[PDB]
Design a protein around this ligand. Structure first.
Ligand SMILES: [Zn+2]
Length: 197
């Protein structure tokens, strides 16, 4: 089966936000609103903001999961390639097969779904701390889009779901991801291709 990717703000007005990092050659993570697409280097910090209109209940959680974007690949589990799943880059918590990690959150939990075999990482939803108006989760993507035997140049989407304590849906948002060596250049190229089309 294929998890839903339908945008759903829900009762709490849940949606994502992204920094404005630009497209310089030195950028390691950059988000294109025109493409709804995050470009990032391998295993680099990807800040993703969570915005709500009202505070969800204690025990609300935030889950991230990757799926293939293309119709003909949506049913295939997104995982790390045969090389990276055997890398000695464990953080002590993420299973080595998981593409998406949460960085610097000891309450992150990693799920291997017993029925779909899909991977996800989930953290407690925290209120913005004093001063701030949103919360930020720091994600890492642990394979390249181009990795042979893994994503194999196929685009993926990340689906972020707001869930209650039972895992029921409260809100949903999503974005395409390209994990690549040159995020700034590739974002420039793809935004140009979009402008030409
Ligand atoms: Zn890989």
């Amino acid at each position: 089966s294929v998890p839903s990717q339908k945008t759903y703000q829900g009762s709490y007005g849940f949606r994502l936000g992204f920094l404005h990092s630009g497209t310089a050659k030195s950028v390691t993570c950059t988000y294109s609103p025109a493409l709804n697409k995050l470009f990032c280097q391998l295993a680099k910090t990807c800040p993703v903001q969570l915005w709500v209109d009202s505070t969800p209940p204690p025990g609300t959680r935030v889950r991230a999961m990757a799926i293939y974007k293309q119709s003909q690949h949506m049913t295939e589990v997104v995982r790390r390639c045969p090389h990276h799943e055997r890398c000695s880059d464990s953080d002590g918590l993420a299973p080595p097969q998981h593409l998406i990690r949460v960085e610097g959150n000891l309450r992150a939990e990693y799920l291997d779904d017993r029925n779909t075999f899909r991977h996800s990482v989930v953290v407690p939803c925290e209120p913005p701390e004093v001063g701030s108006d949103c919360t930020t989760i720091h994600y890492n993507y642990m394979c390249y889009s181009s990795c042979m035997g893994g994503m194999n140049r196929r685009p993926i989407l990340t689906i972020i779901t707001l869930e209650d304590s039972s895992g029921n849906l409260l809100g949903r948002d999503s974005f395409e991801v390209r994990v690549c060596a040159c995020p700034g250049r590739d974002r420039r190229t793809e935004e140009e291709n979009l402008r030409k089309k």
